[PDB]
Amino acid sequence: MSISISYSTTYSGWTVADYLADWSAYFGDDGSNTGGFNPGPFDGSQYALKSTASDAAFIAGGDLHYTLFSNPSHTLWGKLDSIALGDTLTGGASSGGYALDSQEVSFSNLGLDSPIAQGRDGTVHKVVYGLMSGDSSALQGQIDALLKAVDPSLSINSTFDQLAAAGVAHATPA
Questions:
Q1: Are 73 and 67 in contact (CB under 8 A)?
Q2: What does residue 34 show for φ and ψ, rounded to 5 degrees?
Q3: Binding residues
Q4: How many domains does the chain have?
Q5: DSSP state of 33
Q6: For residue 103, what are the domain limits?
Q7: Could you count the other beta carbons within 10 Å of the beta carbon of residue 66?
Q8: Which of 12, 46, 57, 99 has the fewest beta carbons under 10 Å from its own?
């Protein structure tokens, strides 16, 4: 039920805020590339998007819905459980899901749920739209609150190693 974070050892000494600001810049600052919905076509347990500026990519996990041209137009809503940040996006429905070949960091048990009615005002829309427009600030907001609810000493300014020491993060081989 609690937020769980996995991080490449490369990012051991980084704060979550510094890593997220850097990955957002990596992605760069509308469209879509080499990803999509799993299963799709306009709904998935996964929504995956590659940058048009770099190999940077993310996968949003949960029960997600894109309204397309239906009112409210161009809204991503539903349940957002997880965000996986990295590069070299691969796979699809056929491969049994999307994956990052280089998964740098992932956030699980985000517990976000936005209804269709809130349109592009929905937290899920803002969090994911943020990542796509090189602004990770909404995501940081939600992580920061999730960390504080486990342990009020923890923040987006905790290093990954500090969050591992507090039982919410686990390192993966680099």
A1: yes
A2: 55, 10
A3: 66, 74, 120, 129
A4: 1
A5: -
A6: 1-174
A7: 19
A8: 12
The secondary structure of residue 168, as a DSSP letter, is: S
8: left (phi over 0), alpha (psi -120 to 50) or beta: beta
Binding-site residues for heme b, in ranges, read: 66, 74, 120, 129
Radius of gyration of the chain (CA): 15
Distance separating alpha carbons of residues 45 and 63, to the nearest angstrom:
5
Examine residue 152 and say whether the peptide bond preceding it is cis (omega within 30 degrees of 0): no
Can you read off the two tokens belonging to residue 15? 């704060």
Which neighbouring-strand residues pair with 43? 65
Residue type, 141: G
Closest CA to 120 of 136, 134, 138, 106: 138
Cβ contact 98:89 at 8 Å:
yes
Solved with: X-ray
Binding site membership for heme: which residues?
Answer: 66
* Sequence-ordered list of residues with C-beta below 8 angstroms from that of 90, at least 6 positions apart, any chain: 98, 99, 100, 101
